[PDB]
Amino acid sequence: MDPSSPNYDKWEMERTDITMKHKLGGGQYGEVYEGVWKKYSLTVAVKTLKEDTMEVEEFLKEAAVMKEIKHPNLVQLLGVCTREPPFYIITEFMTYGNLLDYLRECNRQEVSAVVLLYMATQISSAMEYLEKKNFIHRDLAARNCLVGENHLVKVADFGLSRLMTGDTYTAHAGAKFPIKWTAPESLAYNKFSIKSDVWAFGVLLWEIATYGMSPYPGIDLSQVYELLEKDYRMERPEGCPEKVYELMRACWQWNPSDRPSFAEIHQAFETMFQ
Numbered sequence: 533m534d535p536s537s538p539n540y541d542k543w544e545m546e547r548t549d550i551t552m553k554h555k556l557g558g559g560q561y562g563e564v565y566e567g568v569w570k571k572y573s574l575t576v577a578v579k580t581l582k583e584d585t586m587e588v589e590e591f592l593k594e595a596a597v598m599k600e601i602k603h604p605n606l607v608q609l610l611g612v613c614t615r616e617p618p619f620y621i622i623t624e625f626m627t628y629g630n631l632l633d634y635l636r637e638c639n640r641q642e643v644s645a646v647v648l649l650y651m652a653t654q655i656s657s658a659m660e661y662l663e664k665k666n667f668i669h670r671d672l673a674a675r676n677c678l679v680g681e682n683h684l685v686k687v688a689d690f691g692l693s694r695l696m697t698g699d700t701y702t703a704h705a706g707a708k709f710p711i712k713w714t715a716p717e718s719l720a721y722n723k724f725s726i727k728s729d730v731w732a733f734g735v736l737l738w739e740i741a742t743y744g745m746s747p748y749p750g751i752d753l754s755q756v757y758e759l760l761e762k763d764y765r766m767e768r769p770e771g772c773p774e775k776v777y778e779l780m781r782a783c784w785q786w787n788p789s790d791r792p793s794f795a796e797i798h799q800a801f802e803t804m805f806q
């Protein structure tokens with residue numbers, strides 16, 4: 533917009549510059565469309581807001597939040613169109629889609645053990661950065677990660693709460709939570725911190741080591757807490773290095789203060805990967 537204007541925002545861009553297309557992922561992400569940033573012949577993802585919905589306040593808050601973060605392993609904000617409806621939030625488009633489906637559909641000969649370790653290392657790096665900035669993710673899981681070229685992985689947040697139609701998210705006082713990725717303190721006291729993100733990261737590592745399997749297979753949601761309290765934890769996935777599993781259990785300590793920090797988790801992975 534206008535550089536001299538009192539309301540100048542470098543991120544605001546021209547709605548006309550983007551060629552809007554079909555909805556991304558057959559609708560799995562919601563009101564997110566594939567687009568073409570003409571000026572650069574660049575394919576992008578454009579999240580928008582339904583036909584004037586009572587969520588503008590939340591939408592704009594997301595946009596503001598994204599303008600505050602930047603890291604090679606966090607989906608990159610490219611611009612916004614929150615001056616006049618329909619509101620837009622544009623980020624890069626990741627060629628191979630979300631990590632969950634990527635892991636389930638990949639060439640396992642290509643996506644070997646070293647590659648899995650590499651993917652977990654990139655994710656821990658992004659979280660280490662959010663930790664540093666005192667930000668909290670709240671919904672860390674393979675489904676919220678994107679895969680680019682050369683196994684580049686980036687953490688995102690698609691606000692899947694009401695989008696998912698499966699048993700991943702379950703109701704709780706007008707809100708939905710992915711019970712199998714939620715820390716005990718979060719299920720019991722609605723307390724979310726970077727430590728509950730670390731617990732969720734533990735589950736994510738499990739998803740990665742199993743090439744995308746569902747957590748606590750077979751166990752019904754209503755008994756998960758009790759079991760975690762009884763000190764039950766997921767077994768070491770087949771082929772999962774001892775060191776990585778050791779990391780998993782540390783993330784699953786009942787007491788959050790006893791869980792390693794992402795700084796420690798990442799430092800550990802670097803050592804390993806090398």
Ligand SMILES: Cc1ccc(NC(=O)c2ccc(CN3CCN(C)CC3)cc2)cc1Nc1nccc(-c2cccnc2)n1
Pocket residue numbers: 556557561564577578579594597598607621622623624625626627628629630667668669670678687688689690
């Ligand atoms: C178009 C868009 C708009 C917004 C976002 N937002 C985020 O990804 C995100 C990540 C981290 C935070 C940080 N925030 C801190 C506070 N806590 C509570 C929540 C998280 C916020 C938003 C992503 C996108 N990108 C996006 N969205 C859906 C699908 C895809 C997609 C799908 C397939 C291939 N390529 C891209 N890409």
Ligand SMILES: [Cl-]
Pocket residue numbers: 542
């Ligand atoms: Cl500026």
Ligand SMILES: [Cl-]
Pocket residue numbers: 557628629630
């Ligand atoms: Cl996807």
Ligand SMILES: [Cl-]
Pocket residue numbers: 666667668669
């Ligand atoms: Cl936050």
Ligand SMILES: [Cl-]
Pocket residue numbers: 625626627628679680681
């Ligand atoms: Cl890409």
